[PDB]
Amino acid sequence: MPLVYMNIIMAFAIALAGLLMYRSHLMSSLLCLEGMMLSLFIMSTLIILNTHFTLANMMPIILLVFAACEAALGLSLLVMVSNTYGTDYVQNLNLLQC
Amino acid sequence: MNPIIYTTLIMTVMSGTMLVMISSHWLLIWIGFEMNLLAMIPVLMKNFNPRATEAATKYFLTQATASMMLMMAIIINLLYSGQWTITKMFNPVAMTMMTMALAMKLGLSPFHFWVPEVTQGISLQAGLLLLTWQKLAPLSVLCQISQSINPNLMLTMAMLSILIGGWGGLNQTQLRKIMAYSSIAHMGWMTAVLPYNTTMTILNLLIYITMTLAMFMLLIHSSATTTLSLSHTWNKMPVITSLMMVTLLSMGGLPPLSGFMPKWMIIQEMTKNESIIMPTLMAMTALLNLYFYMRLAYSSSLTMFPSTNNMKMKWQFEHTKQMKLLPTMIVLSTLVLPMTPALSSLN
Amino acid sequence: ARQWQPDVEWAEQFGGAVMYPTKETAHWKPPPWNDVDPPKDTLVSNLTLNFGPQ
Amino acid sequence: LQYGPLAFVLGERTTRKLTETSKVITVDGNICSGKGRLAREIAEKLGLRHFPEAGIHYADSTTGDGKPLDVQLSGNCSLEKFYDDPKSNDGNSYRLQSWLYASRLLQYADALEHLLSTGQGVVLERSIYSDFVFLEAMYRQGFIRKQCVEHYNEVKKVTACEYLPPHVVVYVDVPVPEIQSRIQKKGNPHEMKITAAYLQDIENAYKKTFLPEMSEKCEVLQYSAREAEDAEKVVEDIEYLKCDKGPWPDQDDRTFHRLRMLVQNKLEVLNYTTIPVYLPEITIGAHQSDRVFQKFTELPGRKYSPGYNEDVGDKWIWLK
Amino acid sequence: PTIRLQEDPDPEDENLYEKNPDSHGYDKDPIVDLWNMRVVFFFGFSIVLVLGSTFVAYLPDYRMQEWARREAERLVKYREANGLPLMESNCFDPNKIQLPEDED
Amino acid sequence: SDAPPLTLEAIKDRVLYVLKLYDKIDPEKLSVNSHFMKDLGLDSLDQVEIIMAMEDEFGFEIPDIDAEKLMCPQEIVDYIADKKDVYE
Amino acid sequence: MLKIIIPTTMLLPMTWMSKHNMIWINATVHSLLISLISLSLLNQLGENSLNFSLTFFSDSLSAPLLVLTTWLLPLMLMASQSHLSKETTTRKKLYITMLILLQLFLIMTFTATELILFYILFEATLVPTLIIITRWGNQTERLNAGLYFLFYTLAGSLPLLVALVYIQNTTGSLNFLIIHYWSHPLSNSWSNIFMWLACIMAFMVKMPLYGLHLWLPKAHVEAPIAGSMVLAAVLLKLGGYGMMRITTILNPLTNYMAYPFLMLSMWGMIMTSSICLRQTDLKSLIAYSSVSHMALVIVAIMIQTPWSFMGATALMIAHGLTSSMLFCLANTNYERVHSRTMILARGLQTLLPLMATWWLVASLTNLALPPSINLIGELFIITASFSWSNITIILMGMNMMITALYSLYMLITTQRGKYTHHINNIKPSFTRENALMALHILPLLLLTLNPKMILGPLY
Ligand SMILES: CCCCCCCCCCCCCCCCCC(=O)OC[C@H](COP(=O)([O-])OCC(O)COP(=O)([O-])OC[C@@H](COC(=O)CCCCCCCCCCCCCCCCC)OC(=O)CCCCCCCCCCCCCCCCC)OC(=O)CCCCCCCCCCCCCCCCC
Ligand SMILES: CCCCCCCCCCCCCCCCC[C@@H](O)O[C@H](CO[C@H](O)CCCCCCCCCCCCCCC)COP(=O)(O)OCC[N+](C)(C)C
Ligand SMILES: CCCCCCCCCCCCCCCCC[C@@H](O)O[C@H](CO[C@H](O)CCCCCCCCCCCCCCC)COP(=O)(O)OCC[N+](C)(C)C
Ligand SMILES: CCCCCCCC/C=C\CCCCCCCC(=O)O[C@H](COC(=O)CCCCCCC/C=C/CCCCCCCC)COP(=O)(O)OCCN
Ligand SMILES: CCCCCCCCCCCC(=O)SCCNC(=O)CCNC(=O)[C@H](O)C(C)(C)COP(=O)(O)O
Ligand SMILES: Nc1ncnc2c1ncn2[C@@H]1O[C@H](COP(=O)(O)OP(=O)(O)O)[C@@H](O)[C@H]1O
């Protein structure tokens, strides 16, 4: 493979680890989700352009649309959490246990 | 919520699940999952409270992570083969990502932590939907790619799911958490047989869905979410408690009840493949689920707990809303063992 | 002589937030009867601004 | 077509029936005050439906035949023996208070259902909002325990928050000596034993907690004993009130639909009255509970659903 | 109240002999009691025990013991009438048995 | 779990600690029975500061009417024990 | 075989359609009629079994057990109706329904041709017994007793299910006829050893084997009278019947796989007989005596000789009848004095002479007096053990001595001496109780005249 493929894959891995490891702010994790989506977009676009598969040139656009849907969902949930607690910290979300 | 809006959201959830069901293209399956999650998030929050908000947030985070892993696996599979069809993945790493993603979507161990909390934080109707309808799509995807799964990882996750479901259910007094741990154990049982026979997985899915629907409807009818609240139902609706006790015995897998048939068929199918140790451990561990079912039956129907004075006023009122399918679900959850050979129609 | 039935003390074993109470989970309190927690006094401070003199 | 989501979707709405005369009205006052006559007169003048004060057997009036049932099958409390022995070690006092709160909750649900379904207004004597004055009076007189007050507060917190407060709160003011004098002139031997401290506690609870609390979300009309006989004047005072204070103007079709779904289905209304809090005064053992439940089921029209008891003349059961 | 709960007191068990000096211990209703005793006695002692024992005693010899005795008598008579041994140490004919040809 | 079952000895030790940390008091001439106004020579304003230090130490507010009675460390310890429901 | 099953099912709507005051009469009459009908299965062919159809068959081993179950149901109904007089009509009908379902599962269990159906019914017997014990038990320990009874059984039974499905996969069938005719030896391997254990331990724990018997005292003491009757008389015999059916395919491994079980059974029968000597509860003594008798049955099954199986069958039948009679005798006194302590009520022979006669006869049958069938089975088992090894006679004689000792100890403690002074509520024996004892005891003595009916297929 090209080394750019490894760079994009490691970008995805770093963003996934950033999401999986949580600091105080909820907003930081949403940004990590958006970063994973961006890396997926870049990787899929590179794969589609390299192989000249004409019909999937539209697939990353659909990816972006559902990324926007995910981001809107996350922001709405953050609005409700911050309205409840006055802060978007994840440690406030501990009313429910296992 | 406007009833029209609620109907539209439920139809959107169902249509996303059906899109996952009928698609031949990986992108369309991903789209179905995305639409299902998007329409599912408001349903968890229909009755607004901080607990519902927290449950919805945890659910969204878990499912979004699973969706990201799903898409990454699809992209790897495309990279190593210019294929979009869901037939059999061509890369072991992509397949491992796919398995981890689908297990996180299903709530299999060790990705089980979200299920009890989300189930506890929502209403009983949302819990019913989450524990019945939300399992169809990832299970269908796993059924389509069954020949590609690594048996070691899948069976490890299934055994962990059964063990953790039993142990977690041992410690619960809230009914929703009990049902969530029961769901985790049943998912483990279902995914244990998937690498060998998808028909067994489908049969286990159908029986588990029937029993879970009957149990959740019985819990809605007697509007209780804790053990002590359900302990009062004998003094107002003894028939409901008796049906609950019989359904609980069925869920424990005791013959000649219906819940025994999926475990029996899974064990015999696994023995056909020279797998003896793991089904033995699986049954010996489902003994724990039977134990906490029996504890609930002791507290609910077989003995009579003390009641309160205000129950006399409740004695004078009937149920305004009646559930149409509750009688059928109870009968199918209990008395369908003699109809076992009908499973051939599932393949 | 009559059959024994559970009483208040027996029933109270299942009234806790969790079975098998340990030292750490003893401070866990059962959730409210309805699934509504009481609102927190997290007063959002308004922003104070000096409008003028310059 | 029973009211539900289907009825709300096609056609049926609540706001289209509000006609400026709905005005949930409660006419409160101390013991033996003429609040009942004033409330009935207000209902007759304004054309609203009148609700007599909810007693021990209010639920009996709404189910089956309107006849009351036996005390041990309904209520399991006596107001007379509360006057006789308020400190009895059988828990009669708090049992009576909790049963009366449940009855008032049921009556409030019925009145709200009537107003939301027909648009016609309702008039209530007391309410779940003013029920706590008797609880406070009992607690200050040493009639109930602190735990009983805590259980009452829990039940009220989980129940009364689901409903809209009345538009108009009418308080009939009678000084405690006049209350006592009316008490002796009445003739009931049990009410003769009501001490002045108990009535003073009720009046203090009213004037220090209830009226200031309702004045923030409702408009209050106070009337002395002498000026409470002028029903026309009170009605004229009500007819010239601007209801721009409480949450009622903040109500649209969706909140009305939720409230109408809640006011019917009385089991959902009463759900949180029987919460598993084991107070000795209200906890009933398994044997007594079983015996009383069987005896209730042996009542002539209570074994089956309303239209399915053939011994009270129901017909075509095999085709229902 | 110093009490924990509202409970009915444990009642005293009532003697069936008190209202019915000859009460058979089957039921509170004397007529139902008498008929319960009668049906129990008739369908247990009269129908099952005696008639069933007679039926079992006169069960036909399906076990083939008299037949076995007669067959044994015939075989013994035939065998010692000719000087043949009464029984062979071999149950099956050695001529229809094909042992492995070599033992070493 | 939460904090251990606080006892009288720990309360008394903490009270003497916060009093010895107060600069207008002799570290060695201070006793559990010393009187602030007479034994230590402290002014009323000084006493108010001490009560405020106690409120900081034990994490709960003290009204003025209760504070005016508190004229020695033993009274402070007894008041804290009564408010926190500590018998030993 | 349908001529037995269908009336048993018809017992359910018949008792659900009866009047509130006729349920006991109707159920008893039709249960007795069903027992009379089932009595016709004792006609056995000798050479082979009676194969009614593909699903059911009757053997010389199954027929006495079926007759015992059908005969036990009316006795259970007669014993139950006294302590259930205050119950509502619906709950009494539910109790009778539990009894009828238990009878149906038992009669289907003993006649199944195929081992998976046998397993399904043999597990299905659990639910009615559990419901009876945990709902109509008297004390607060019934919940713990039910949990013990359920989980001890299931922990042994699940490996049996795994072994059965594996065996059907490897052989191609589990039908008992095909299993017997196509039997092949089990080699000496770890896989075969664990297959043997999985095929044996469920029936071991149902007997129960000593060391796995802790559930039995709890369940038998804490259950109502009918529950104890069915637990001791019939449900203990499921393990023995299963062993006799399953050891056909276990040879030649049983030759040495039975050593720990034989050792446990002999020493534990000694231990339980000794335990019976120091017991303060009257029902626990009967339970432990049952454990000792079933240990002797386990030895008989393990040694694999025709005389051993004949003695085991006779001992199973005799023990069932005797244990049911003893439990009913204890229940009468418990109903009198509302306590299970043996020394609370003494000298009952002075107050109840006929019940004392019933006590004496039950104690004599418990110690296996000749020529009762109890001693027939015990003597056959002892002779088979002596053939197995001459040193077994020491343990057999010790067990006989201790059995006589605690049997007569119970009789003397309960019936002899002087009456307790303060106890003054001991009424004369009812006709129902005397009839129940007579209906227990008379078949026992009548079976002596025709011992071959209960000796089994090896006869
Ligand atoms: C009671 C209430 C309290 C509680 C009760 C508790 C009990 C509950 C019981 C529950 C129900 C149980 C049901 C069991 C059913 C059993 C049926 C059965 O299997 O029958 C078999 C069997 C019938 O045999 P079979 O297979 O029909 O035989 C057919 C033959 O091929 C051909 O035979 P054959 O041609 O020789 O015919 C003979 C024929 C005719 O034989 C004769 O007439 C000739 C006799 C000789 C007469 C010679 C003198 C008279 C003539 C000359 C004098 C007048 C003229 C000369 C005048 C001269 C003047 C100077 O009469 C007979 O067949 C014999 C009588 C049969 C009676 C069977 C009765 C069974 C009843 C079953 C139900 C019982 C329920 C209880 C109530 C029973 C009723 C009270 O009956 C007997 O076994 C009878 C036993 C006889 C024993 C003989 C003595 C043996 C002594 C050995 C022991 C020595 C030591 C001391 C031991 C003492 C032990 C007592
Ligand atoms: C209380 C007062 C007591 C004093 C009064 C006592 C009166 C006298 C008592 C003594 C009587 C002694 C009787 C001796 C036996 C005589 C009859 C005997 O010979 O018949 C036997 C018959 O016995 C029966 O066959 C066996 C009894 C069957 C028992 C079935 C009971 C019914 C079922 C009840 C439920 C059972 C549940 C448990 C079952 C497993 C043996 O038959 P057999 O010698 O061969 O027959 C030869 C001729 N045949 C073959 C043509 C008939
Ligand atoms: C309280 C009551 C509970 C129920 C009791 C159940 C009893 C179960 C016991 C099973 C009986 C014996 C099992 C197997 C038979 C022999 C076992 C072994 O010790 O024998 C030797 C086996 O050699 C070694 O000992 C291997 C076994 C050593 C490991 C086993 C651990 C035993 C420790 C005891 C643990 C307790 C077990 C029960 C837990 C409750 C024989 O030597 P060898 O001829 O070469 O091997 C024969 C097998 N081949 C043919 C396949 C080769
Ligand atoms: C309530 C108390 C009762 C307890 C009873 C529990 C004992 C049950 C007996 C053992 C259970 C497992 C048996 C497995 C089913 C047998 C099927 C079989 O024979 O398959 C074996 C498989 O054998 C095994 O895998 C057995 C391994 C053991 C797994 C679980 C071990 C748990 C503990 C075992 C010892 C305890 C059992 C006796 C204890 C009794 C109670 C104390 C061979 O198959 P193949 O792989 O094809 O080999 C031939 C081709 N190469
Ligand atoms: C960060 C920099 C801050 C600097 C700015 C600070 C400015 C704040 C100034 C505010 C001044 C006031 O409030 S003025 C306070 C009001 N009045 C008085 O102080 C005089 C009357 N009081 C008495 O005479 C008492 O007896 C007494 C002598 C106290 C004895 O007390 P004890 O014997 O009971 O201890
Ligand atoms: N919540 C309550 N607690 C205790 N007693 C009550 C309560 N509500 C009503 N009562 C009783 O109702 C009795 C008379 O009712 P009231 O309205 O004061 O007089 P009137 O019949 O003239 O309207 C009084 O004795 C009073 O104690």
Coordinates of N, CA, C and O in Angstrom, one line a residue, chain D residues 29-116:
Chain D
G29 N -61.8 26.4 53.4 CA -62.2 27.0 54.7 C -61.9 26.0 55.8 O -61.7 24.8 55.6
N30 N -62.0 26.5 57.1 CA -61.8 25.7 58.2 C -63.0 24.8 58.5 O -64.0 24.8 57.7
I31 N -63.0 24.1 59.6 CA -64.0 23.1 59.9 C -65.3 23.8 60.2 O -65.3 24.9 60.9
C32 N -66.4 23.3 59.7 CA -67.8 23.7 60.0 C -68.1 25.1 59.5 O -69.2 25.6 59.7
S33 N -67.2 25.7 58.7 CA -67.5 26.9 58.0 C -68.5 26.6 56.8 O -68.7 25.5 56.4
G34 N -69.2 27.6 56.4 CA -70.2 27.5 55.4 C -69.7 27.4 54.0 O -70.3 28.0 53.0
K35 N -68.5 26.8 53.8 CA -67.9 26.7 52.5 C -68.7 25.9 51.5 O -68.7 26.1 50.3
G36 N -69.4 24.9 52.0 CA -70.2 24.0 51.1 C -71.4 24.7 50.5 O -71.6 24.6 49.3
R37 N -72.1 25.5 51.3 CA -73.2 26.2 50.8 C -72.8 27.3 49.7 O -73.4 27.4 48.7
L38 N -71.7 28.0 50.1 CA -71.1 28.9 49.1 C -70.7 28.3 47.8 O -70.9 28.8 46.7
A39 N -70.0 27.1 47.9 CA -69.6 26.4 46.7 C -70.7 26.0 45.9 O -70.7 26.1 44.6
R40 N -71.8 25.4 46.5 CA -73.0 25.0 45.8 C -73.6 26.2 45.1 O -74.1 26.1 43.9
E41 N -73.7 27.3 45.8 CA -74.3 28.5 45.2 C -73.5 29.0 44.0 O -74.1 29.4 43.0
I42 N -72.2 29.0 44.2 CA -71.3 29.5 43.1 C -71.5 28.6 41.9 O -71.6 29.0 40.7
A43 N -71.6 27.3 42.1 CA -71.8 26.3 41.0 C -73.2 26.6 40.3 O -73.3 26.5 39.1
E44 N -74.2 26.8 41.1 CA -75.5 27.1 40.5 C -75.5 28.4 39.7 O -76.1 28.4 38.6
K45 N -74.9 29.4 40.3 CA -74.9 30.7 39.6 C -74.1 30.7 38.3 O -74.6 31.0 37.2
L46 N -72.8 30.3 38.4 CA -72.0 30.2 37.2 C -72.3 29.1 36.2 O -71.8 29.1 35.1
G47 N -73.2 28.2 36.6 CA -73.5 27.0 35.8 C -72.5 25.9 35.7 O -72.5 25.2 34.8
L48 N -71.6 25.8 36.8 CA -70.6 24.8 36.8 C -71.1 23.6 37.6 O -72.0 23.7 38.4
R49 N -70.4 22.5 37.3 CA -70.7 21.2 38.0 C -70.2 21.3 39.4 O -69.0 21.6 39.6
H50 N -71.0 20.9 40.4 CA -70.6 21.0 41.8 C -70.1 19.6 42.2 O -70.7 18.6 41.9
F51 N -69.0 19.6 43.0 CA -68.4 18.4 43.5 C -68.5 18.4 45.1 O -67.8 19.2 45.7
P52 N -69.4 17.7 45.7 CA -69.4 17.6 47.2 C -68.1 17.1 47.7 O -67.4 16.3 47.0
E53 N -67.7 17.5 48.9 CA -66.4 17.2 49.4 C -66.1 15.7 49.5 O -67.0 15.0 49.9
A54 N -65.0 15.3 49.0 CA -64.6 13.9 49.0 C -64.5 13.3 50.4 O -63.7 13.8 51.1
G55 N -65.3 12.3 50.7 CA -65.2 11.6 52.0 C -64.5 10.3 51.9 O -63.7 10.0 51.0
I56 N -64.8 9.5 52.9 CA -64.2 8.1 53.0 C -64.7 7.3 51.9 O -64.0 6.4 51.3
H57 N -66.0 7.4 51.5 CA -66.6 6.6 50.5 C -66.9 7.3 49.2 O -67.8 7.0 48.5
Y58 N -66.0 8.2 48.8 CA -66.2 8.9 47.5 C -66.0 8.0 46.4 O -66.7 8.0 45.4
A59 N -64.9 7.1 46.5 CA -64.7 6.2 45.4 C -65.9 5.2 45.2 O -66.1 4.8 44.0
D60 N -66.6 4.9 46.2 CA -67.8 4.1 46.1 C -68.8 4.7 45.3 O -69.6 4.0 44.6
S61 N -68.9 6.1 45.3 CA -70.0 6.8 44.6 C -69.8 6.7 43.1 O -70.7 6.9 42.3
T62 N -68.5 6.4 42.6 CA -68.2 6.5 41.2 C -68.1 5.1 40.5 O -68.0 5.0 39.3
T63 N -68.1 4.0 41.3 CA -67.9 2.7 40.8 C -69.1 1.8 41.2 O -69.7 1.9 42.2
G64 N -69.4 0.8 40.3 CA -70.6 0.0 40.5 C -71.8 0.8 40.7 O -72.0 1.8 40.0
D65 N -72.7 0.4 41.6 CA -73.8 1.2 42.1 C -73.2 2.3 43.0 O -72.3 2.0 43.8
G66 N -73.8 3.4 43.0 CA -73.3 4.6 43.8 C -73.4 4.4 45.3 O -73.0 5.3 46.0
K67 N -73.9 3.2 45.7 CA -74.0 3.0 47.1 C -72.6 2.8 47.8 O -71.7 2.2 47.2
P68 N -72.5 3.3 49.0 CA -71.2 3.0 49.8 C -71.1 1.6 50.1 O -72.1 0.8 50.3
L69 N -69.8 1.2 50.3 CA -69.5 -0.2 50.8 C -69.2 -0.2 52.3 O -69.2 0.9 52.9
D70 N -69.0 -1.4 52.8 CA -68.7 -1.5 54.2 C -67.3 -0.9 54.5 O -66.4 -0.8 53.6
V71 N -67.1 -0.4 55.7 CA -65.9 0.3 56.1 C -64.7 -0.5 56.0 O -63.6 0.0 55.6
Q72 N -64.8 -1.8 56.3 CA -63.6 -2.6 56.3 C -63.2 -3.0 54.8 O -62.0 -3.4 54.6
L73 N -64.1 -2.9 53.9 CA -63.8 -3.2 52.5 C -63.5 -1.9 51.7 O -63.2 -2.0 50.6
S74 N -63.7 -0.7 52.4 CA -63.5 0.5 51.7 C -63.1 1.6 52.7 O -63.9 1.9 53.6
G75 N -61.9 2.1 52.7 CA -61.4 3.1 53.7 C -60.7 2.4 54.8 O -59.5 2.7 55.0
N76 N -61.3 1.5 55.6 CA -60.7 0.9 56.8 C -60.3 2.0 57.7 O -59.3 1.9 58.4
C77 N -61.1 3.1 57.8 CA -60.8 4.2 58.8 C -62.1 4.8 59.1 O -63.1 4.7 58.4
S78 N -62.2 5.5 60.3 CA -63.4 6.1 60.8 C -63.0 7.5 61.3 O -62.1 7.7 62.1
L79 N -63.8 8.5 60.8 CA -63.6 9.8 61.3 C -64.1 10.0 62.7 O -63.5 10.8 63.5
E80 N -65.2 9.3 63.1 CA -65.7 9.4 64.5 C -64.7 9.0 65.5 O -64.6 9.7 66.5
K81 N -64.1 7.9 65.3 CA -63.1 7.4 66.3 C -61.8 8.2 66.3 O -61.1 8.1 67.3
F82 N -61.5 8.9 65.2 CA -60.4 9.9 65.3 C -60.8 11.0 66.2 O -59.9 11.5 66.9
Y83 N -62.0 11.5 66.2 CA -62.4 12.5 67.2 C -62.4 11.9 68.6 O -62.0 12.5 69.6
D84 N -62.9 10.6 68.7 CA -62.9 10.0 70.1 C -61.5 9.7 70.6 O -61.1 10.2 71.7
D85 N -60.7 8.9 69.8 CA -59.4 8.6 70.3 C -58.4 8.9 69.1 O -58.0 8.0 68.4
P86 N -58.0 10.2 69.0 CA -57.0 10.5 68.0 C -55.6 9.9 68.2 O -54.8 9.8 67.2
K87 N -55.3 9.4 69.4 CA -54.0 8.9 69.7 C -54.0 7.4 69.8 O -53.1 6.8 70.5
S88 N -55.0 6.7 69.3 CA -55.1 5.3 69.4 C -53.9 4.6 68.7 O -53.4 5.1 67.7
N89 N -53.4 3.5 69.3 CA -52.2 2.8 68.8 C -52.5 1.9 67.6 O -51.7 1.0 67.4
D90 N -53.7 2.0 67.0 CA -54.0 1.2 65.8 C -53.8 1.9 64.5 O -54.1 1.4 63.4
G91 N -53.3 3.2 64.5 CA -52.9 3.9 63.3 C -54.1 4.4 62.6 O -54.0 4.6 61.3
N92 N -55.2 4.6 63.2 CA -56.4 5.1 62.5 C -56.3 6.5 61.9 O -56.8 6.8 60.8
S93 N -55.5 7.4 62.6 CA -55.5 8.8 62.2 C -54.8 8.9 60.8 O -55.3 9.5 59.9
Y94 N -53.6 8.4 60.7 CA -52.8 8.6 59.5 C -53.5 7.7 58.4 O -53.4 8.1 57.2
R95 N -54.1 6.6 58.7 CA -54.8 5.8 57.7 C -55.9 6.6 57.1 O -56.1 6.7 55.9
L96 N -56.7 7.3 58.0 CA -57.8 8.2 57.5 C -57.2 9.3 56.7 O -57.8 9.6 55.6
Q97 N -56.1 9.9 57.1 CA -55.6 11.1 56.3 C -55.1 10.6 54.9 O -55.4 11.3 53.9
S98 N -54.4 9.5 54.9 CA -53.9 9.0 53.6 C -55.1 8.6 52.7 O -55.1 8.8 51.5
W99 N -56.1 7.9 53.2 CA -57.2 7.5 52.4 C -58.0 8.7 51.9 O -58.5 8.7 50.8
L100 N -58.1 9.8 52.7 CA -58.8 11.0 52.3 C -58.0 11.7 51.2 O -58.5 12.3 50.3
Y101 N -56.6 11.7 51.3 CA -55.8 12.3 50.3 C -56.0 11.5 49.0 O -56.1 12.1 47.9
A102 N -56.1 10.2 49.0 CA -56.3 9.4 47.8 C -57.7 9.7 47.2 O -57.8 9.8 46.0
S103 N -58.7 9.8 48.1 CA -60.0 10.1 47.6 C -60.1 11.5 46.9 O -60.7 11.7 45.9
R104 N -59.4 12.5 47.5 CA -59.3 13.8 46.9 C -58.6 13.8 45.6 O -58.9 14.5 44.7
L105 N -57.5 13.0 45.5 CA -56.8 12.8 44.2 C -57.7 12.3 43.2 O -57.7 12.7 42.0
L106 N -58.5 11.2 43.5 CA -59.4 10.7 42.6 C -60.5 11.7 42.2 O -60.8 11.8 41.0
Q107 N -61.0 12.5 43.1 CA -62.0 13.5 42.8 C -61.4 14.6 41.9 O -62.1 15.1 40.9
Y108 N -60.2 15.0 42.1 CA -59.5 16.0 41.3 C -59.3 15.4 39.8 O -59.6 16.1 38.9
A109 N -59.0 14.1 39.7 CA -58.9 13.5 38.4 C -60.2 13.5 37.7 O -60.3 13.8 36.5
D110 N -61.3 13.2 38.4 CA -62.6 13.1 37.8 C -63.0 14.5 37.4 O -63.6 14.7 36.3
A111 N -62.8 15.5 38.2 CA -63.2 16.9 37.8 C -62.4 17.4 36.6 O -63.0 18.0 35.7
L112 N -61.1 17.1 36.6 CA -60.3 17.5 35.4 C -60.7 16.8 34.2 O -60.8 17.4 33.1
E113 N -61.1 15.5 34.3 CA -61.6 14.8 33.1 C -62.9 15.4 32.6 O -63.1 15.6 31.4
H114 N -63.8 15.8 33.6 CA -65.0 16.4 33.2 C -64.8 17.7 32.4 O -65.4 17.9 31.4
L115 N -63.9 18.6 33.0 CA -63.7 19.9 32.4 C -63.0 19.7 31.0 O -63.4 20.4 30.0
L116 N -62.0 18.8 30.9 CA -61.3 18.6 29.6 C -62.2 17.9 28.6 O -61.9 18.0 27.4

